[PDB]
Write a protein that binds this ligand. Structure first.
Ligand SMILES: [Cl-]
Ligand SMILES: [Cl-]
Ligand SMILES: [Cl-]
Ligand SMILES: [Cl-]
Ligand SMILES: [Cl-]
Lengths: 162, 157, 156, 159
């Protein structure tokens, strides 16, 4: 299936035109300390980071920043990402054998930063939905940190609660 | 326990105050969400939640009159009870599920002062429909959250 | 990704299609799918195996109007997980599911299909899946053998 | 409100009484120590209790709590309490659960459990093994529940 965790849904009637992904950045770096703690890494551990844009109905809707433990994702390259017709979580499953069983999220409303605003086609200060996620594999092992910034003007985040 | 659906968590306990309580003919949208007849009477409440002495949420709720008859400002403001608990104990309506739609919005001129912010300030808007037994809708609740000290926590399977 | 709703997890999955048939909706099925009475539905029975042993028996009911062309030939011609097929071939994506879980005794009918004795405790998962607009699109009844696997759930 | 995590819902149309069976302090079993992220040999409080609905036994729950945080938890406190257990943990002990992770399976009623649910040994029960978490992902409870799902089911919504 198309999505693992994405809760974007259109405001208007119909099936959510499916998200198109475009990789913006891809680098390896030393984990910032907050990242290393979220991923239960040793200080100084290398992480792969990706920035991507999701677009829906030909309009940018999400800017995602992801951080992955360098250890498990050594094979991850820009060439792989950009050639890949897969959604990221599907890629992590098929190429890297990493399947997420749970995600813990923290949602807030924030102002569009000077850096983010033009990537979403908006003015700085525009309210955006920030979704900070840590995703877990089996045994409560953290394997991804993702911070999403969502422009919720034509789309909402759908949540059912028990 | 203290909370039924509230997902506010500190980045590093809620106190409620009733702003408004009123009975009226259900607006179209409400009648639809609550699956009421046209113009059926509903009770509407506006309320403010604060945490750590600071305003955090404004909620507008709409409830079907026929299940919430005794529901008065007097019952409310004399109530030292959370609203879902009041609905359970006093009215015998327990919620089994809620469906929510979350968005980020600019603080409206109406809401902004109620949260101590400038109009335009980013707020989390949580539109909820709560269901009781039989997939029966019992409440429409629109919440505007100031997320400067608090976030909305969610776990996904 | 591989799964939409499946919560089976190893204490530490291959699908075989048994049937795919059109019939008039049984009453409980038309009610759940909100169909006119006796509306045509497609029903599927399938078996999931994990580690080369049968683990789940699923029965599924889908509205015929949205699943025209959903045949045994298609299901066998195709590689796809059923939810992925419903999205890619039929354009039906599930946004929500409501489930009811019970422990039940393996019925004389189901016990042989899981390789167990009638009476054996099974996890019964009764699901209704919804698409956009809170339209029910699927009724799925699963019976799960939970001797090596459990159903994982996180609660808020 | 009445329930924190309980997902029991009746099969029959429409809209739960607790009785303490056992209570004591013990050295954590190794698996319990691991679930609660305790040091080896830490003391836990353990409670068994019965839930009934419609004046019939429906649930047997076994609970393990960190002895450190739950020093004042006594039998006399429990049986005098008019509160739901999660309500007591909140109000008396300041422990509030933000999340529960569960593992559900169908099991045979054991000779020990069966009499307490009014069933015969071998009857199918739903086992719900739970770890509950407070803020910061700190585990504060292990609960194993055994549910008779003959007139009740476990309701779950999935996104
Ligand atoms: Cl590009
Ligand atoms: Cl008040
Ligand atoms: Cl979920
Ligand atoms: Cl939940
Ligand atoms: Cl007694």
């Amino acid at each position: 299936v198309r999505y693992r965790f994405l809760r974007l849904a259109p405001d208007e009637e119909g099936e959510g035109g499916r998200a198109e992904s475009r990789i913006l950045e891809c680098r390896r770096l030393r984990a910032p300390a907050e990242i290393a703690r979220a991923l239960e890494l040793r200080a100084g551990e290398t992480v792969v980071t990706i920035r991507r844009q999701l677009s829906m109905n030909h309009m940018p809707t999400v800017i995602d920043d992801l951080w992955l433990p360098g250890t498990h994702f050594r094979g991850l390259t820009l060439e792989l990402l950009t050639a890949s017709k897969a959604p990221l979580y599907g890629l992590f499953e098929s190429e890297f054998g990493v399947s997420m069983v749970r995600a813990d999220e923290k949602l807030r409303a924030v102002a569009a930063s000077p850096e983010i605003a033009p990537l979403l086609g908006v003015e700085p200060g525009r309210p955006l939905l920030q979704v900070d996620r840590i995703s877990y594999t089996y045994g409560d092992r953290p394997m991804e940190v993702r911070r999403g910034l969502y422009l919720t003007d034509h789309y909402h985040y759908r949540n059912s609660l028990n």
